[PDB]
Amino acid sequence: ADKELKFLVVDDFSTMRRIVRNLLKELGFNNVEEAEDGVDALNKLQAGGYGFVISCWNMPNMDGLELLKTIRADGAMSALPVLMVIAEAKKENIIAAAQAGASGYVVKPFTAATLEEKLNKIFEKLGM
């Protein structure tokens, strides 16, 4: 897909956001913004222009699942791709995320090759 796509990386840990931003940079995606929680992310998404969201599951104020459910219920961004990042492979959370419309999930820490593969399969399914 277009490497110009604007990404939003959501996580309450700045170091984790830097890691994901670096992995996107390795893959050639330079247009990235950050958010510390689900509410902050929704506020940036309203600004428009985003094409992809990578979000942490566990965050204060509004967690990853609630952010995902809010994006999917929004008329202007209902199909916005959302990749969930989880700390452990808890089946209940993977299924909850899938049922809520996650585009995919990755267990951190993840490699650039894993990110690339997830991005490719996701854009592929969307015809982008």
Q: Give the integer Cα–Cα distance in Å for 74 and 69.
A: 9
Beta-sheet pairing, 104-107 with 52-56: unpaired
Provide the 3-class DSSP secondary structure of residue 85.
strand
Resolution in A: 1.8
Provide the 3-class DSSP secondary structure of residue 52.
strand
Q: Give the integer Cα–Cα distance in Å for 79 and 72.
A: 6
Domains in the chain: how many in total?
A: 1
How would you label 50-80 residue by residue, b for 16+ Cβ within 10 Å and e otherwise? Answer: bbbbbbbbebeebbbbbbbbbbeeeeebeeb
Q: At what angle do helices 14-27 and 112-126 cross, to 10 degrees?
A: 70
Structure-solving method: X-ray
Tokens 């309450």 label which residue? 12
Domain with 18 in it: 1-128
Instruction: Name residues whose C-beta falls within 8 Å of residue 8's C-beta, 6 or more positions apart in sequence.
Output: 32, 33, 34, 35, 41, 44, 45, 50, 52, 53, 54
Q: Do 54 and 85 touch, CB atoms closer than 8 A? A: yes
Cα–Cα distance list, 52 to 6, 78, 88, 91 (Å): 7, 12, 23, 24
| CATH code for the domain of 64 | 3.40.50.2300
